């Protein structure tokens, strides 16, 4: 764990000014690890970081398959890395792997989302950026299609997709099927966004046996409504022609240039689309098309969080925590990359009527319930089991199963796991 120098105590520019080492920072931003990156690349951020700390050297390592490779590395339990973006590992294991930045109580004072990546009152991960759950869209394609107001319900959304399919040349909704994480992203919409309830994720979901079934009183809400949105898009012919060959890098330029109308991704994705071509002002961001009793909701959550390897020397832990502190407070990464800065001190107009909510903690003694039901059901809700979402695309496309049948398969597995825990 930490060496007696806590994240709130770091005097930026003062502390650790005497250290001379190299630290290794693993992250998912392969694009930023190139000199071609359209915006501010890693070299630049570290160029600026060294203006203030010339003798802390930072080796940036990036992997396209980040979730699996970071987890494998994490499980190897060595000192081959100093910082990584934290992969899909249960919070109860953070103590095994990561250095605590400090008591959550105190991190709250200095950072947003202090209890997102935390256990037993200590905060082990700091979000690199706060991201809102919405949809990236091409405004020009929408006009071309004669869409006037943005869709707020699943039926409105499919009607708009159909307009795009019939009156434009753009793929209405591009799944990015081959990217496991892009499919896993649909789970970022099923709790706050689909229910308006900040307690859904950590309380209602893991105490509900069959949460994926159609909500009978409000059938256009709740997780079913999200997953059906994907199913219907694929099955009605509103997605790419060949899901098996989607290409994520290509799709940026394609949406910039009007060849794609929508992609269901978090707000981090907007500037990446904007810089992919000459048509940045054509990219917008809209709320996900669910309305709950007259209001729309969008969950704010962390993008990848920084984690510090607990196996490294006291000296390397410190320089790591300093580079985090700097990235957080002085780099300006989070804006530049299209989200909410995490240092604790007005977004798209399309969201001005959206209630922004964040998941609340479980009740006392139930903090580990979701992770345990998730593990036993093997559904991996909001982990990066993109696999079950890939399953939706495949079966909607080959028409072998209805969404009701898919959701019932998940419920049976979830319901066993709920009773078991
Ligand atoms: O579900 C985990 C985590 O996902 C975050 O979003 C990530 C993606 O999961 C993915 O790693 C994505 O990587 C891109 C990168 O943005 C760039 O496009 C590069 O060219 O290609 C890689 C993929 O190879 O980056 C985003 C943003 O970090 C985000 O949704 C979190 O809230 C979530 O917990
Ligand atoms: Zn994999
Ligand atoms: Zn895959
Ligand atoms: Zn109901
Ligand atoms: Zn009401
Ligand atoms: Zn168990
Ligand atoms: Zn199947
Ligand atoms: Zn199955
Ligand atoms: Zn029971
Ligand atoms: Zn029980």
- Domain limits, the chain: 1-421
181 within ligand 1 shell (Cβ under 6 A)? yes
85 with 129: CB under 8 angstroms?
A: no
Instruction: Look at the block and give the residue holding tokens 């609340």.
Output: 360
Rounded Cα–Cα distance for residues 61 and 361 (Å)? 33
From ligand 9's centre to the CA of 371, what distance in Å?
Answer: 18
184 within ligand 1 shell (Cβ under 6 A)? yes
Edge-to-edge strand list for the sheet holding 260-263: 171-173, 260-263, 134-138, 283-287
Query: Which of the ligands is closest to the CA of residue 374?
Result: 6
88 with 28: CB under 8 angstroms?
A: no
Element (H, E) at 130: strand 130-132
Beta strands 296-302 and 130-132 are antiparallel
Which residues have a beta carbon within 5 Å of ligand 3, which is an ion? 180
Instruction: Look at the block and give the residue holding tokens 């694929």.
Output: 234
Query: In the 8-state DSSP scheme, what is residue 375?
Result: H
Query: Which backbone phi and psi does 172 adopt, to 5 degrees?
Result: -60, -55
Beta strands 260-263 and 171-173 are parallel
Which residues have a beta carbon within 5 Å of ligand 5, which is an ion? 293
CA dihedral for 393, 383, 43, 325, sign (positive or negative) = positive
From the list 373, 348, 374, 370, the residue with the least C-alpha distance to 361 is: 370
Six-digit token string for 296? 């729309």
384 within ligand 1 shell (Cβ under 6 A)? yes
Q: Going by C-beta distance under 8 Å and a sequence separation of 6 or more, which residues neighbour residue 160?
A: 142, 145, 147, 151, 172
Beta strands 354-357 and 296-302 are parallel
Q: Is 91 helix (H, G, I), strand (E, B) or coil?
A: helix
289 within ligand 1 shell (Cβ under 6 A)? no
DSSP string for residues in 48-73:
HHHHH-SSEEEEEEE-TTHHHHHHHH
| Sequence-ordered alpha helix ranges (H) in 220-313 | 222-235, 248-256, 269-275
415 with 207: CB under 8 angstroms?
A: no
Element (H, E) at 302: strand 296-302
Cβ neighbours around 79 below 10 Å, total: 12
Q: Going by C-beta distance under 8 Å and a sequence separation of 6 or more, which residues neighbour residue 12?
A: 52, 322, 325, 326, 329, 330
| Sequence-ordered alpha helix ranges (H) in 276-326 | 314-326
Query: Which of the ligands is closest to the CA of residue 400?
Result: 7
Rounded Cα–Cα distance for residues 191 and 159 (Å)? 24
Q: Is 367 helix (H, G, I), strand (E, B) or coil?
A: coil
Structure solved using which method? X-ray
Rounded Cα–Cα distance for residues 287 and 298 (Å)? 7
Element (H, E) at 391: helix 387-398
* Residue 15 backbone class (left: φ over 0; alpha: ψ -120 to 50; beta: rest): beta
245 with 408: CB under 8 angstroms?
A: no
């Amino acid at each position: 764990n930490k060496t007696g120098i806590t994240y709130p105590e770091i005097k930026l520019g003062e502390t650790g000014k005497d250290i001379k080492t190299t630290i290794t920072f693993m992250n998912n931003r392969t694009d930023m690890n190139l000199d071609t990156y359209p915006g501010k690349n890693w070299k630049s951020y570290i160029e600026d970081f060294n203006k203030m700390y010339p003798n802390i050297t930072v080796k940036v390592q990036t992997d396209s398959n980040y979730a699996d490779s970071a987890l494998t590395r994490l499980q190897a339990n060595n000192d081959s890395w100093d910082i990584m973006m934290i992969p899909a590992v249960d919070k109860s294991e953070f103590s095994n792997y990561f250095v605590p930045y400090g008591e959550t109580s105190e991190m709250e004072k200095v950072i947003k989302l202090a209890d997102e990546k935390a256990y037993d009152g200590q905060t082990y991960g700091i979000a690199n950026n706060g991201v809102t759950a919405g949809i990236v869209y091409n405004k020009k394609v929408f006009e071309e299609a004669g869409i006037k107001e943005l869709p707020k319900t699943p039926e409105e959304f499919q009607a708009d997709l159909k307009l795009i399919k019939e009156k434009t040349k753009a793929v209405p909704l591009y799944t990015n099927f081959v990217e496991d994480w892009a499919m896993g992203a649909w789970d970022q919409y099923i709790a706050g966004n689909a229910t308006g309830d900040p307690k859904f994720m950590n309380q209602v979901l893991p105490t509900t046996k069959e949460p994926f079934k159609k909500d009978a009183s409000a059938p256009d809400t709740h997780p079913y409504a999200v997953y059906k949105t994907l199913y219907d898009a694929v099955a009605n012919g509103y997605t790419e022609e060949d899901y098996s060959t989607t290409d994520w890098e290509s799709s940026k330029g394609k949406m910039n240039n009007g060849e794609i109308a929508t992609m269901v991704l978090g707000a981090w994705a907007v500037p990446q689309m904007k810089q992919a071509g000459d048509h940045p002002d054509d990219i917008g961001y809209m709320p996900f098309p669910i309305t709950v009793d007259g209001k729309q909701y969008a969950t704010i959550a962390g993008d990848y969080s920084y984690g510090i390897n607990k196996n490294i020397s006291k000296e390397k832990q410190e320089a790591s925590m300093i580079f985090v502190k700097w990235m957080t407070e002085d780099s300006g990464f989070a804006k530049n990359e299209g989200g909410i800065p995490i240092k604790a001190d007005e977004t798209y107009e399309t969201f001005s009527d959206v209630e922004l909510i964040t998941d609340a903690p479980a009740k006392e003694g139930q903090e580990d319930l979701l992770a345990n039901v998730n593990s036993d059901s093997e559904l991996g809700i909001n982990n990066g089991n993109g696999k079950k979402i890939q399953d939706i695309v495949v079966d909607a496309a080959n028409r072998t199963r209805t969404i009701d049948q898919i959701m019932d398969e998940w419920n049976q597995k979830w319901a066993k796991a709920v009773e078991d825990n």
